[PDB]
C-alpha cells in the first residue's frame, strides 16, 4: 500500500533493465553474424598437418583450450534448468551463493541468448575459414588449402624467402608447436589475459552481491524484515519505519540500474572492437604492428570466453641480430642508367666463400645470403647513393 503511492518508480527500474537486456541480445546477434564466414572448410582429425593445433579442434562440442579456460575460471553458474529445484535443497551455503539468494531477493539472472554448443559452432566455422582464406585477395572466394601452405604464404609475406622456408619446414613446424603447447599451461594468475577474464566474472558477481547486502542493511528501522517491524511496532509508527526501508531499497535499485547501463555501454563498444579484431587478425594476417599481437603477426585463433571472446595471436620474433654492410642499389659501371633495387630484401656483401665486395640478396625477416636474380630485383632510376660495379655483375645487370 505504501509502495502503491510510489507507483511508477518500481516500473521505471524494471523498464530500464528490460531495455538494457534487449540491447545486449542485439549486440550478441550483430557480433556473431560478423564472426560467421560465408565459406568454410570442415574440421577433420589431424587438421593442421605438421602443425599440432589439436587443442583448437572440438572434442566430439567445445574445444580443449576453451574447456580449460572455462574450467580454470572461478564462476558460479546458475542452473537455468531446475536451478530453483537445486537451490531448494542447497545444503550448507557455500560463499553466500548469489543464485540461491536471488530467488529470496527477487532478482533473476537471464540465460544467455546463444547455447554453449551454438557459440562453439560459430568458433569452429571461423577456424576452418582461416586455413582457406585465399592468398590472391579472395574476400568473396574460398580456396581450400592445407594449413601448412597458408603458413608458408604468410611467412613469405613477412620477408622470409621461400627457399629458407622449404629448408627449415620441419624446424618451423616444431617451433610453432612449442608456442601452441605453452598456451595449455598459459592460464595462470601471472597471465594478464586470464586475470581480465576473472575480473569480468568478478564485476558481474559484485552487482548481485550489492543487491543481497542492501536487503540485509537496515535504514532507520528496528529490523530489515518488514514483518519484524510490524509485529514489534504500533501501526502509525510502522508506516514511517516501512517508508524509510522503502526509500533505501528504491535508491539501491536506481543505483544498480545506473551501474548496469554504464556497464552495457562499455560492453557494446568493446564488442565492436572484438568484431574489428576478428576481421583484422583472425580472418587475415595484419601488416599493422601491435594492433593484434607483439612482433610480426602471422595467424590468430579465437575461442569463446565467459563474458567475451578470447583471442590468441601467433607472432614472429627476431633473435640473434647481426650487423652487415648493405647497399641501397647496384648499377653497372658501363651502363649508369641500368640499376637494380632489392624487393622485400636488402643487398648485402658476401665475404664468406666468395670474392670481396661480392653482392647477395637476403630476406628482410631472416638472414640468408642468396644469389641476386631478376625475381628478387626491381629496375630503378640511377641514384648517387647506388654503388657502381665494374666486375662480377649480377645477372639482372648483364647487358
Amino acid at each position: 500500500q505504501l509502495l502503491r503511492e510510489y507507483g511508477q518508480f518500481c516500473s521505471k527500474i524494471n523498464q530500464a533493465l528490460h531495455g538494457a537486456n534487449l540491447r545486449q541480445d542485439d549486440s550478441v546477434r550483430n557480433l556473431f553474424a560478423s564472426v560467421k564466414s560465408s565459406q568454410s572448410s570442415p574440421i577433420i582429425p589431424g587438421f593442421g598437418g605438421d602443425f599440432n593445433l589439436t587443442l583448437l579442434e572440438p572434442v566430439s562440442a567445445r574445444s580443449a583450450i576453451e574447456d580449460l579456460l572455462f574450467d580454470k575460471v572461478t564462476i558460479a553458474d546458475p542452473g537455468y534448468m531446475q536451478g530453483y529445484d537445486d537451490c531448494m535443497q542447497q545444503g550448507p551455503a557455500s560463499a553466500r551463493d548469489l543464485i540461491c539468494a536471488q530467488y529470496v531477493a527477487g532478482y533473476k539472472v537471464l540465460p544467455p541468448l546463444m547455447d554453449v554448443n551454438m557459440e562453439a559452432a560459430y568458433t569452429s566455422s571461423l577456424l576452418g575459414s582461416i586455413a582457406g582464406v585465399g592468398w590472391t585477395a579472395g574476400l568473396s572466394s574460398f580456396a581450400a588449402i592445407p594449413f601448412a601452405q597458408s603458413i608458408f604464404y604468410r611467412l613469405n609475406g613477412v620477408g622470409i624467402t621461400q627457399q629458407v622456408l622449404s629448408e627449415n619446414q620441419k624446424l618451423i613446424a616444431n617451433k610453432f608447436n612449442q608456442a601452441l603447447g605453452a598456451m595449455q599451461t598459459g592460464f595462470t594468475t601471472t597471465n594478464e589475459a586470464f586475470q581480465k577474464v576473472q575480473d569480468a566474472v568478478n564485476n558481474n558477481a559484485q552487482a548481485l552481491s550489492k543487491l543481497a547486502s542492501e536487503l540485509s542493511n537496515t535504514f532507520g528501522a528496528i529490523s530489515a524484515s518488514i514483518g519484524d517491524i510490524i509485529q514489534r511496532l504500533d501501526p502509525p509508527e510502522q508506516d514511517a519505519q516501512i517508508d524509510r526501508l522503502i526509500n533505501g531499497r528504491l535508491t539501491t535499485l536506481n543505483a544498480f540500474v545506473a551501474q548496469q547501463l554504464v556497464r552495457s555501454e562499455s560492453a557494446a563498444l568493446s564488442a565492436q572492437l572484438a568484431k574489428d579484431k576478428v576481421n583484422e587478425c583472425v580472418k587475415a594476417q595484419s601488416k599493422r604492428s601491435g594492433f593484434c599481437g607483439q612482433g610480426t603477426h602471422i595467424v590468430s585463433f579465437v575461442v569463446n570466453a565467459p563474458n567475451g571472446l578470447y583471442f590468441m595471436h601467433v607472432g614472429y620474433y627476431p633473435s640473434n641480430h647481426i650487423e652487415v654492410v648493405s647497399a641501397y642499389g647496384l648499377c653497372d659501371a658501363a651502363n649508369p642508367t641500368n640499376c637494380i633495387a632489392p624487393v622485400n630484401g636488402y643487398f648485402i656483401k658476401t665475404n664468406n666463400t666468395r670474392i670481396v665486395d661480392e653482392w647477395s640478396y637476403t630476406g628482410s625477416s631472416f638472414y640468408a645470403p642468396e644469389p641476386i636474380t631478376s625475381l628478387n630485383t626491381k629496375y630503378v632510376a640511377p641514384q648517387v647513393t647506388y654503388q657502381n660495379i665494374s666486375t662480377n655483375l649480377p645477372p639482372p645487370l648483364l647487358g
Binding site: 502503491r4 507507483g7 511508477q8 516500473s11 524494471n14 523498464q15 528490460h18 534487449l22 530467488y103 527477487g106 533473476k108
Partner: protein, 336 residues
Amino acid sequence: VSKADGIIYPQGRTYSNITITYQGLFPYQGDHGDMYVYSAGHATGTTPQKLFVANYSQDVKQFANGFVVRIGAAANSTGTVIISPSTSATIRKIYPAFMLGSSVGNFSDGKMGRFFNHTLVLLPDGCGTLLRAFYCILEPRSGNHCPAGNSYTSFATYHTPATDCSDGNYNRNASLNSFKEYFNLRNCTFMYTYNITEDEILEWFGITQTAQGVHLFSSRYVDLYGGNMFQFATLPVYDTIKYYSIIPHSIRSIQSDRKAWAAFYVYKLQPLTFLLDFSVDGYIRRAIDCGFNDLSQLHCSYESFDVESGVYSVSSFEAKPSGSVVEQAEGVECDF
C-alpha cells in the same frame, strides 16, 4: 473493464483524449457480484393472497468501502416470472431498495436483518418515478405478520400496478405506506427525493461513504447511455456504515397479467489502480485493471493499451507457510 462497467468518473476533474493511471474505489475485474430478483406476489385472479419475497431482508452484508449496482441489465427481452416458472413475460427494468445500518440487532422473534436506531433507507416509488433517502429511525410495529407482531416472516415493500401505477398519475406514497406498515418512523432526520425519468435503458447506481458525507452516484444524470457514474447527491450521514441489506419488493399484479423484473447485480468497491482511457468527449470508453493479470500489469506499467511483443519479467509467486512452529523454555507446572 474493457467496456468500463461500474467505473466511477473522477469527481474532482475531467480528462480529455488522454490515458492515465488513476487510484480510486473500483470493482474487481471479472466479478460476477451478488444478484437480487424482485417478483410479483401470489394472486388468485382478482386478489393477491400474499407477497412473494426471498430471504434478502434476513441476509446482512458488510458495507465495506461501498458498492456499485447494475440496474435493468436485461430489458425488452423474453423472460420467465420468478413466482410462476410456466408464465413468461417481457423483462422490465426494476429499481433496487437498500437499507444501511451502522449497527445490527436481532428481531423480536430473533430473526436476522433487524437494524439499530441509525438507519439509512432508500426505496423507489410510483413505478420508479422517484427515489427517497431518510434516516427515519425505524420502530417495530405489532401486527399480524409484522416485525414486533406474532407470526413475523419478513419485512417487504409492495406496489399495485392496477391502481398505484397509471399514465395519468403515479402514487408517490405507495411504497412509503407499505414501508410504514412494517416499521413506524420516529425521530426522522433529513429526507431527500430525486426524480427519475422512465426508460428501459441500462443504468448504473453507486453509493460510497466519505468524511464530508455519504455520496450517491447515478449514470443517468450525466452519461445514461455510457453508464459512467457521476455523483448526483450528498447525504449528511456522519456515523460509519458497517452493514447494509436489500429490502425485498413484491408487485401485487393481477394473476392474469404479470411483468418479469430485471435482476440487479451488486459489486463491492476496493481501492485499485486502474489505467483509464479518456475520449475527446471525456467519457471513459475503456479501462484496464493491473491486479487481475500479468499482461494487465504490463499495460499499466507502460501506461498504454498496446504493449510491444517481447518477454517481460512479472511479479514472482511467493511460497505460503504450511504451519507455525514455536519452541521456548517450559513455562513450568504448578504442583498439587
